[PDB]
Amino acid sequence: EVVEQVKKLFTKLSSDPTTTSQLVANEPASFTGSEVRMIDDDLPLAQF
Amino acid sequence: QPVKLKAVVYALSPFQQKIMTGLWKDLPEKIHHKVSENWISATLLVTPVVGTYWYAQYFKEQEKLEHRF
């Protein structure tokens, strides 16, 4: 019954050829050793 | 007594940067800075030494020539 309603309602979808595996491949994610220190001596607790 | 500071500091890892090429980066501007700021200081250190030395050689030469028959 869930499959039948999905077939009935989800009809006007984009069907764009863009695929997620190609997106991550052309714009990969890499790690860079680095740090950001936001010094604020008015806060009672430090969080890192 | 501790200071109370508020600032944001971003730092990059030493293993992500070139270590040595910055020594010869914009070399001409470095020399320009060193001579521009310090030429008065170098003159106040070099002129008395060289001037007093030159006079002493000038004195000794003349005194050596007056005693010569």
Side-chain angles (χ1 to χ4, degrees), chain A residues 1 7 9 12 21-22 47-48:
Chain A
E1 295 49 12
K7 256 183 278 155
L9 309 159
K12 337 151 199 76
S21 294
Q22 295 81 311
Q47 312 153 239
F48 66 106

Side-chain angles (χ1 to χ4, degrees), chain A residues 33-37 39 41-42, chain B residues 4-9 11 13:
Chain A
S34 52
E35 51 145 36
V36 45
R37 271 157 207 262
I39 304 153
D41 283 355
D42 299 310
Chain B
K4 281 214 325 173
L5 188 147
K6 161 156 211 333
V8 188
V9 190
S13 174

Side-chain angles (χ1 to χ4, degrees), chain A residues 18-48:
Chain A
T18 325
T19 313
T20 189
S21 294
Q22 295 81 311
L23 309 163
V24 291
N26 302 324
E27 248 160 35
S30 53
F31 189 92
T32 293
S34 52
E35 51 145 36
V36 45
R37 271 157 207 262
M38 290 156 294
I39 304 153
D40 195 350
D41 283 355
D42 299 310
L43 295 162
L45 296 177
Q47 312 153 239
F48 66 106

Side-chain angles (χ1 to χ4, degrees), chain A residues 2-17:
Chain A
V2 162
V3 172
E4 216 44 30
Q5 274 282 295
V6 164
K7 256 183 278 155
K8 232 70 172 83
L9 309 159
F10 288 86
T11 48
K12 337 151 199 76
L13 278 179
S14 156
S15 300
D16 179 329

Side-chain angles (χ1 to χ4, degrees), chain B residues 49-64:
Chain B
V49 174
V50 168
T52 308
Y53 185 86
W54 211 310
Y55 169 89
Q57 258 60 51
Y58 164 80
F59 186 95
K60 295 222 325 303
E61 189 82 297
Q62 318 304 318
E63 104 173 328
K64 192 198 47 129

Side-chain angles (χ1 to χ4, degrees), chain B residues 3 10 14 25-26 30 34 36 38 40 45-46 48 55 61:
Chain B
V3 86
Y10 311 83
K25 161 210 175 64
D26 313 349
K30 289 176 172 124
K34 293 209 209 285
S36 152
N38 302 334
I40 297 181
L45 167 70
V46 152
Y55 169 89
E61 189 82 297

